[PDB]
Amino acid sequence: KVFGRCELAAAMKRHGLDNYRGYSLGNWVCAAKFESNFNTQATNRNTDGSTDYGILQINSRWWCNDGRTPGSRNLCNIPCSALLSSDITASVNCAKKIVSDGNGMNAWVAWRNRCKGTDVQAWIRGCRL
Ligand SMILES: [Au+]
Ligand SMILES: [Cl-]
Numbered sequence: 001k002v003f004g005r006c007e008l009a010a011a012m013k014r015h016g017l018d019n020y021r022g023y024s025l026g027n028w029v030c031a032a033k034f035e036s037n038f039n040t041q042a043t044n045r046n047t048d049g050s051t052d053y054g055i056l057q058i059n060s061r062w063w064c065n066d067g068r069t070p071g072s073r074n075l076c077n078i079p080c081s082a083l084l085s086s087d088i089t090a091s092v093n094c095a096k097k098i099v100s101d102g103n104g105m106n107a108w109v110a111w112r113n114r115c116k117g118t119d120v121q122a123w124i125r126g127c128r129l
């Protein structure tokens with residue numbers, strides 16, 4: 001599913017992601033933007049042979065199982081394909097565990113590169129939450 005900007009922002013809230021580990025909601029929406037352009041079915045291979053899955057490009061090297069990433073963990077105890085659902089509970093459960101990993105949102109290279117320090121509130125502009 002391709003979520004609307006406000007649509008995702010509200011789903012993320014209801015799921016507790018907003019101010020999670022102290023990252024304000026527009027940090028998340030910003031991250032989802034640049035990782036997946038809001039598309040839950042987004043998949044992307046990395047040079048190391050692992051793949052990133054879904055709305056937040058959760059990586060099969062440590063977080064989920066895809067059956068093809070050699071030497072890999074499944075910290076979120078889920079098959080990577082559940083990270084492609086239209087309901088984002090699974091990706092969000094997993095992202096909670098990733099951002100609690102010690103480096104916060106830096107774990108999303110794209111967040112650090114494109115959202116970190118910018119005016120994130122702009123991503124939840126005009127939304128009814
Ligand atoms: Au959801
Ligand atoms: Cl594997």
Ligand SMILES: [Cl-]
Nearest residue numbers: 011086087088
């Ligand atoms: Cl949802």
Ligand SMILES: [Cl-]
Nearest residue numbers: 021103104105
């Ligand atoms: Cl932090």
